[PDB]
Symmetry: D2
Subunit: 393 residues, 4 copies
């Protein structure tokens, strides 16, 4: 298997740089956690002789990681021609870049891609930290369903868009918040997680869960955003008191403590790069693609994607489901967390928002992405007219 792969890259010896170039062109990064042993071995070899790899040295280096390297080089990844795909991503990025309207809650614009096989691409401002805000709502819902199951969670929150052209009603007709993607629903979801412990431990628990979803890439916290959310959270206090009065919380809930935790969760920071990996975990059935670790149950992921599909883009949710047909979640910092199930996760970020509250550039990019590729939920992988299918050669 090491030999087979040796011949593919070879003709007596392989220069190390040639192996690295070929590896990167598959879309994997040399820092990928699943390539740690291989890359450690290569570094050790460049020490123990001072740039050329025979059959035997090669086998020694790649043997621990041979399954993944074989899939990579045999073009078995979900997107086999990754270089051609990222060239299209860059063109969509540049086209969205020209849409400069909208209002910040301005010129920063980044897009990151992580496939379900861990292939990575970034364009623009993808290493700048920003708060998740409402992008965290699907993530904490997934955690709640993961730990508690669908039946328990949906005793407290509903499963459908309100329809009302406003977040204006807090409760559906059964006295539950409409869904986990609206503020009242996210507040109730927050109350379900890790009940019985203090806020510091609840927060640590959620942070550890997000670290795993992001394959240990950047997850941080903006104390400045937290302070500001809590000082202008009058609408959220209104929701909290309303839910308390209507008995919407689990028995023994400290409602004002839950609101504080809620503001903390909104203030969690990511980059486009780290958030794309979180989205890829959702695209990959709850397994983190760059570590192989099982993070969320399949039930948690399926429910989260269903509700992002119908409820994730504020009052634009219905239009977005129809035209784009992908589970997505927007936030006021300008983030759009986007999932292409079975294919990839993305995070798009540009601060200026349209009248609906959605990033202008991200919305434009999402429409162009589905115009180009047969990724709409109800596109037919068989016949798709003029679209490109990046899953094929």
């Amino acid at each position: 298997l090491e030999d087979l792969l040796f011949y593919t890259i070879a003709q007596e010896k392989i220069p190390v740089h040639k192996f690295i170039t070929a590896l990167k062109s598959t879309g994997l990064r040399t820092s990928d956690p699943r390539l740690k042993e291989c890359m450690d071995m290569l570094r050790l070899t460049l020490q123990t002789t001072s740039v050329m790899l025979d059959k035997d040295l090669f086998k020694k280096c790649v043997q621990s990681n041979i399954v993944l390297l074989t899939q990579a080089f045999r073009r078995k990844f979900v997107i086999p021609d990754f270089m051609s795909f990222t060239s299209h991503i860059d063109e969509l990025y540049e086209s969205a870049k020209k849409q400069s309207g909208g209002k910040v809650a301005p010129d920063l614009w980044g897009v990151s891609v992580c496939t379900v096989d861990g292939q990575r691409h970034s364009t623009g401002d993808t290493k700048v930290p920003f708060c998740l805000q409402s992008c965290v709502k699907p993530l904490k819902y997934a955690i709640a369903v993961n730990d508690l199951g669908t039946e328990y969670v949906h005793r407290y929150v509903g499963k459908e868009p309100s329809g009302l052209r406003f977040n204006k009603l807090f409760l559906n007709e059964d006295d539950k918040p409409h869904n986990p993607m609206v503020n009242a629903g996210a507040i109730v979801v927050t109350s379900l997680i890790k009940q019985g412990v203090n806020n510091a431990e609840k927060f640590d628990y959620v942070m550890q869960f997000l670290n795993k979803m992001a394959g240990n890439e950047y997850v941080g916290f903006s104390n400045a955003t937290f302070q500001s959310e809590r000082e202008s959270g009058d609408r959220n206090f209104a929701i909290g008191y309303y839910l308390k009065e209507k008995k919407c919380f689990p028995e023994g809930t400290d409602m004002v403590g839950i609101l504080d935790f809620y503001f903390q969760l909104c203030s969690i920071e990511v980059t486009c790069e780290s958030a794309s990996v979180m989205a890829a975990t959702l695209a990959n059935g709850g397994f983190c693609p760059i570590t192989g670790e099982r993070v969320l149950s399949p039930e948690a992921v399926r429910n989260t994607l269903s509700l992002m599909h119908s409820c994730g883009m504020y009052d634009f949710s219905g239009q977005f489901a129809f035209h784009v047909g992908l589970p997505a979640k927007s936030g006021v910092a300008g983030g759009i967390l986007l999932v292409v199930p079975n294919v990839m996760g993305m995070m798009c970020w540009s601060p200026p928002l349209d009248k609906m509250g959605n990033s202008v550039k991200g919305i434009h990019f999402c429409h162009d992405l589905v115009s180009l590729c047969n990724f709409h939920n109800y596109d037919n992988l068989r016949h798709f007219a003029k679209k490109l299918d990046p899953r094929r050669e």
Copy 2:
């Protein structure tokens, strides 16, 4: 050569293949001997008529060799079809025990149907077929026709024109009491007001008899020429008790929701006719499979609908297709479906198969009790939910795999 390869597969060391042995093997892939794409092969077999040498076999199968090769090399979307239909039969028998609900009675033609009629038909995107129960009994599409006529409208007129007159979203728990959204358009094509507007868009400028003929011809193609009929007795009854639909018609007219030059009372007549179109589970499953197969009819290979028409139809069936149960159905079942008052549920598994489930008794939401029960069990068993993962699906079975 391809015919020879296939000859050896069926021959298994023998010099000649008995005809019955070829037919049995063919049926076990899921294809029917009547499949329109196997016409030349079956014609040749009839001309030959009970033993087939290499040469005679090649003469018979040569015109249809591509399809027969895919069949016998287990390349169909569901390779182990026999095992799959065994699961379908178990789900069928389990739903059969759920005999609650009430048959619709508001007209004599609905009230007449036995509560105990129950059929399920499957047609995969490769034309593999299976039926259990009462699958050859005609019943009216009723609201099951709504996605089909919307697909026709989008096919002929494009998304932009159609959605100038009808919206694209569920109204939400505002029930179905409001006829128009805030932009004075019916909320979507799956509610009565939206379907009435859609009906006014089709084949404009010709009389109702020609509009109806056109729609009937279109449904014939979607069904691969299987049973499509018309119930004049249902039509007469719909039209005499259609007070709610007349209220909608006058309301839309007042709010100028129709294309210029519309004869609103004539459109209502056409609407009642379309609701009275009859299918069987068998023929409707093929229509659903056309939608699962990106607009190509799987048992004919004919392009019937544009990709845009099919995608838009499936999107709206997903969110709007099961009356007030639409949101719950989208969440738990996660498949585009459309129910009707005759007890039909038209069900699409994109890229995999179409189905029609039919049982007259309806739940409190208006949906077939047995069909709803079957749809839940189907997705509990198989990784067919829209947001199931194709790689990691816990203990579900994936019928696309060996």
Copy 3:
């Protein structure tokens, strides 16, 4: 007594002096209750311009009760001349407000000059005053809604009528919903409620007889002044009545009609009732019948039961001015009903009826000049439902010397 009254007006009374004094009370010489007196005066000017004690007694004796109340300043508004002078000033002030749009949805409405403006007053004692265009016929339209509701309650009682229609404003939900939560039209003053009310009247006879019955009832309310019919308005209403057909089918589906109703026949009758014509003068008498507990003030006949009148006034108060109803109830505080021809039927209970008419409508559908006049009227006089009769700051109380 005739003698007492003789001395009040008096050795001999010139006829012209008796007539001018009579007119200054606000009564008209044509008042039906003065017929015998005026007949006797005309006969006297034929036989034998001067009236001694004896001739006077012969003339006024048949009508002496009414003439005594008139001359002893016992009418509801004793200084009527001073009151009508205020009415005229309010009229002239509203005349300057010439904004709004004439209704155009049918040719018969679109036709009316924006500048037509009339106000007529009829007190509960039959005192009359008109200013401006008060003898021009126009269709009641929605102004007929309280009148046919009153007829229904008169003939059938409150409990029967309110089995089919509700008793409350829908709330600023506007009038997009045809039915309340109990599947009844919200009240008799909205189109769906008026359609159901129409189905209750004179059931079991044909439309021609239903119409004749309503017309005879309106004639009595108007003390036999002008009540007519605009066939041209009727034809136009019926050919563009799409919204009303929508309501009719909706009500039929929801079983809102009395058993055996011919819904399309009811719609036809509904359009006929909307096309009934009045003048400001004749409609003010209809409003005065409602102000006077169901007795027509110029004939003394009782047109409607006390129950019918009370219920009609209650619903005009809360539901009568379309989406402006709540604002109108708060600021003006009088039962009123508007219509798309520019009419405002206005009732001051225990005091008077009025009809204000000016075609140009505001954005709510109410006559701009009529609305302006109604506000000024209550700013000036202590007529608001919740003004006090004893302590009213700087308002004038016309029912007081």
Copy 4:
């Protein structure tokens, strides 16, 4: 002279004091009436037989009021016959024993006419909290001090219609009216702005004392503590209004909520509350003191909104059948105004499903079935009703 005329009406040489007192009470006035203070002081100084001269000395300072009383010029001339009807209505409502006390057999009705004629039956001297019955009173204070235009920049003027009171704000982002909780909360924020809550409360208490002609007004600290501990719905309203900028600039919203709970906890008796209602019936003048308490504008606006908005979700039915401005509260009080005639307070703790006192609702319907008091009854033609304004 007026004292002499009155002397003759009450053909002896001398009037026993008891005979003057019993005749006075039969007009409906009480001997403690503040407007009869000088007369009753003089009688006490005199103390049992009164000649022409002594009588004149006693009644002279109050002679105008005593003349109206004895000449049957009061709004209800045959008061004794009227109170006999009130007692029958009282006994008939007494038999309606359903409903649930807010989480019991007490029943009182008090009448005060616009002329200060008084009658009570049942439990009319037991203190209970106004609760929502305070809403029209504080709205009247706000309009009195600030005018209609300013107040209605912050609160609307109409019933919401909506199934219940599920929406806090109308389409213009104002609470629908002053009689719903959100509207009363905004009204509370308008009163005596810029001073602390203790002074705002003192000011309102002084205003209520005048409306009640100085009869019983108290405060239930126990009710206040309970309202604030379970006021989650009111905190939701407060935060919602704050977010939508519904309060005057510089408002301390949590302080306003505290004041709101205090105002709900003010105590009255049926007797003292009937006088407050009579102030509203009498154009803003307190009938038993003659003092001007509220502007005519404040009173008219208050009565208009009580008419359409005062009886929770029963308001539209009540307006149609009863046709009188009224305001109910969760302690079982119904404050009722018959404009130009009288105020009443009905109190019985058990409430119907709408939140209204069962006995009070029954009494209000019977009162208008009997008498031509509906706002759209006619004063000349009224079928078989009794008109208590006539002899």
